[PDB]
Amino acid sequence: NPSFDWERLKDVFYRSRAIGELKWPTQYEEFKCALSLTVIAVEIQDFIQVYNYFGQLLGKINLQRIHEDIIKFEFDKDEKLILVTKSSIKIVKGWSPLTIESVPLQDPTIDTIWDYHNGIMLLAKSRDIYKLNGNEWELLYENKDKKYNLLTKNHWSCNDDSIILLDVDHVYQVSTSNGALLKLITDSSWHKVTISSRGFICLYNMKDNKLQIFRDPARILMEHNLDSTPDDICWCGNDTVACSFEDEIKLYGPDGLYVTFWYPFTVTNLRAEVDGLKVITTEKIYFLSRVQPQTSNIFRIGSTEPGAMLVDSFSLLEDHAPKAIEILKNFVLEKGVLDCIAAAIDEFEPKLQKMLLNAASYGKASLQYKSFDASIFVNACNTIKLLNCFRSFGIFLTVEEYRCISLKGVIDRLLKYHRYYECIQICKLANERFLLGYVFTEWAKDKIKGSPDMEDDELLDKIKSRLSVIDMTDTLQMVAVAKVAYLEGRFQLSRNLALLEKNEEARIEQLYNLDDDSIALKECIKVQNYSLTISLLIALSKKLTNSQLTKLLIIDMFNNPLYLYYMRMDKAYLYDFYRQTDRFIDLAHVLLQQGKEQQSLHSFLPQIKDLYSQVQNSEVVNNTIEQLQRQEKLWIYQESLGKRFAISFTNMTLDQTLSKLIETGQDKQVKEIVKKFKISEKKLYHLKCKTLVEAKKFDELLQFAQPIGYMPFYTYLKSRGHMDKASPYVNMI
Amino acid sequence: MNRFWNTKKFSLTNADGLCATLNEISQNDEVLVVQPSVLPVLNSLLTFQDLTQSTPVRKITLLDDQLSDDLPSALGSVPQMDLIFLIDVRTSLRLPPQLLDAAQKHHIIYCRWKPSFQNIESQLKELSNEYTLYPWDLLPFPQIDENVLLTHSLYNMENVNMYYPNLRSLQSATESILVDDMVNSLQSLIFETNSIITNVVSIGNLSKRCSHLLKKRIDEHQTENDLFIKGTLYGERTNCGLEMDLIILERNTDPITPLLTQLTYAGILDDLYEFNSGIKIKEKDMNFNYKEDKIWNDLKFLNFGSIGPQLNKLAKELQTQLQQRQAFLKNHTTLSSDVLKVVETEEYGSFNKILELELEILMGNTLNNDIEDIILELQYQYEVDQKKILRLICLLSLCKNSLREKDYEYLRTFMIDSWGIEKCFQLESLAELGFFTSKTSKSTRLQKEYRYISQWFNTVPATFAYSGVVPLTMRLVQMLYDRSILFHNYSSQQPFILSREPRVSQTEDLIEQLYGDSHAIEESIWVPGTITKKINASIKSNNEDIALVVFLGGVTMGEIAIMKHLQKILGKKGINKRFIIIADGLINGTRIMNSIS
């Protein structure tokens, strides 16, 4: 039974375990140190060393001589060292390419930084309250007369909302979002505070030991008058408060009782995690967790819960198999299945994890067909599989923390120290794909931002080679990789990197913004999305010149008149374009369309005749000019009729102008038209016959009858308003 | 698919889309500003009374030039009721000039095909910021029949046939925009019904580009796992399996049929008067809705010689029997009264003159020297319109593969004399398109005398759609599922007789002599039967066939009724198929000539 100690305060059990193992066992433990979740930073002379919990030296920030006094250093949320100087604050953004981003005070000439703790900062001379909201000191609280009297640097704290600051006589308070005083208690002689993640405020007196944890003023939740002053009044997650007397940590609890966890070695530092109280010794690291109800029932001595007897039933399957099926029937085999699953995730040792999941899977199938979904079991196995993979890489995370910060938090904490391959396996092990993209693009970002002298030819292979192995989509985001290449100035592969995107819109947009517009236009033809290409051209015309557009269009868009169709309404642009492009047949129709649009073809007609005379590289062109040369004789001859007959003839066809001569009545001019213009014998008859039958009983056809076969003379008379007098043509046939 | 390829749902879904989007813009009164080229589309989905009920819009305006001084009048109405523009830039790539111009002198809804996987505007950036873009998802809804879907992609705001643009230099990009629009529209139908496209057949060079682009935009979306789930989960009718024909044809494959005189009741009405996007005649109008007018459904594809006599039966049937039906019987009688009288009087009749004359070319009876008197008599003796000759002249060239040089320059010269110099550019565009040529991206064109076609495909024996001539488009579709047409005139090598699936085997040689190339027809199969289809089919089987016929470039109303006859004749012979005629607009002889210039 693992319940060797499992001490209780009043009703809940408390356990101590072993987390990792340290490899200092020297002055390093005594030397200043800090913890966030995986790493510990100790200052060894002028050599700040960051060790994970398993004694692996990940990074090493040698002090750049000194250049500024280094009083303290912590980690805020992402394991970024926040070295604080008397003059300014220098966060850390890289470990191989050490790129400390110094954040200075706006006015570093009067005051100076006095303390820094999880963002909110406090000046020295005028005790102001600032906040690190980025690369600046975003002010939160303004000074006043008699603001506060912190006896020593250890008189304040803050986690995310409350900035409780311990005055000499009162206990003031500030909130980040507003920055206002919320005085709690008028009388106070308190000397410490360890506000937790949830907000449970602690206190201490150190004159008479009076640990007085609260949740809000006007209320006391515990008042144990402990005996000896402690060393580190840490927090046990969100529940209880511990101490550190020599090698004696005591998890205090309600109603004046405590549980003692003796340790072989001394106690150096205590980190209050979300659900634990990680305790550092010189040799190894401990974890004063709290026993959940699931494990408090399964593994309790002399237990009777459905969770416990399922484990007993499994332990009897080996030799008493016919004697272990009856135990299942006795109890409710629904709490037992879930208790084992929810307690296997908590346990750290792989041996108990495999037995507990065996116990649940043994009783899991003794339920109804659809009693409960098995996804609870598979999810539990996947969660346990991941939390045991992180242990191989030095990151120890409980179930609570791995869900408080998602897989991105673990990937972020590993990308800092350039462990990209490990992040690849973790993303694959979690069966995730979005994080797989975020891992790769960061690697490609750093390689481009890294080796500057590496030539383009080999470099392009490196990104391509690693991309091929990884199978993923919609998260590679090569445009981010292209931008990084653009920033570094290696724009040669920037197109090349742009050309390897599966999103057509992003590939074209990036190529356009890279100003390789000639290549961008050509590639858009391949996609054949004419909606997209016409959108690029109108955007391309916004910044290029009028002539430069034409130079690009002729060379690359020769046989693709898409942009012209976009401006078919603007005959002005198409006119000068076609002559400059040296297209003459095409230019004629634009001239033609103006004639039909404005209802005047003569005003353009000789000009069209000019254009067909500048190509000569066809056979239909010789036919069209002939129908134009013959039209010239038709037009010039029309003024001849207007100069001797005083009749308008403009804009009249040969067919219409001959009919007019028959209405008035001529002899040779109608015959002059026929022989000069090569008018057939047949067409002359019908044209006047149609005209004559409209001339109100002309009767001249008998005088005209002297090659239509003599038949249609009847029909014009018969089938029109001349039914009468048809008899003469009846016998004429 | 059977319960999902219900075209009536498409019309109601699109109506719900506009109403849902309209309300969220504003709740006070609104004035809709509707582009003229899209107005008949809205009135097909919903009427004025319906629109004002679920939406606050009370007045609809047009983007014509009249909305410039009226815009100021609308500007006063803008304070009373919000202005929401409605534009369509899918096939124009450019906003209506009046809309942008009116913005600088005194909310836009832009149509868009339904999104495929997720579920142009920089022009107005010059005007001002804070512009609001609310897309209107659209699907091709039935307008003339249950099985006929139009996308209205053939025409843009200028009303230029995208397949035959008037500006001849732009046919390399005007044509290719239409194909890109067809694929987007087809994706809208494919993903909405969750259909899986089986073997595909395409005829014509342009058709291949539509199939390949569709395959690229479908392959990039779905995978084999994504294919197994869709077919098995979605019922699949558990009868036979998966089958989705995608016969794709283009107009140039059969250019003779648009040049013929239509005879179906909805063809003559389309021949004399121009239907628009909403299938409503402008000069005399009624609700040409197949859903409402129950009589319109039973008469819209009969031969016009039968509409008259069959209306006596419908009229006397109500005698023994309604008020809504009472107006319907007289309305179609008046339409059959107005149309019939126009037949024998306009152009001195000539409706029977043209019909019997067309046959004299379709069997090669009209000899070379007779062209002089036949063309001349029509223009002068009968006073027939210019288009009715220019359409007939184009028929002469196509049904003899060319014209002799003696007559080719004769007809060209004669057309110039009778109708001015403008015809030397109308007759020039015809020659380039192959409609009127001579002996002297390389799209497909007919290259054979119609004597051979009439002999082979038995186009001149079911001949009710036109003047006693089956369209060659029906024969091309029929020769896939049914080789009985060939087996009596072009036989001794037919692989089979009746095939459920469309087959192109042993017919590539026929096209080589016909269109001048053997590679015009290709059947690039998709997910290959028992390898992926029957494995999915038999999976859900233990543990009819929609045959989309895409018409690139427009379908004449005589080729719509001839598929319904084709669908029926296939049903009795064993190959039971349902034909959904996806197209891009209505095309006639008069529509072509107004677009060729």
Author numbering:
A (entry chain B): 3 to 708, 713 to 739
B (entry chain D): 1 to 106, 112 to 124, 150 to 351, 374 to 492, 502 to 522, 542 to 623, 638 to 691
Sentences from the study reporting this entry:
Lysosomal fusion is fundamental to cell survival and requires HOPS, a conserved heterohexameric tethering complex. The heterohexameric HOPS complex mediates fusion of late endosomes, autophagosomes, and AP-3 vesicles with mammalian lysosomes or vacuoles in yeast, and is probably the best-studied tethering complex. Five out of six HOPS subunits (Vps11, Vps16, Vps18, Vps39, and Vps41) are predicted to share a similar architecture, comprising an N-terminal β-propeller and a C-terminal α-solenoid domain. At the opposite sites, Vps41 and Vps39 bind to membrane-anchored small GTPases (the Rab7-like Ypt7 in yeast), while Vps16 and the SM protein Vps33 establish the SNARE-binding module.
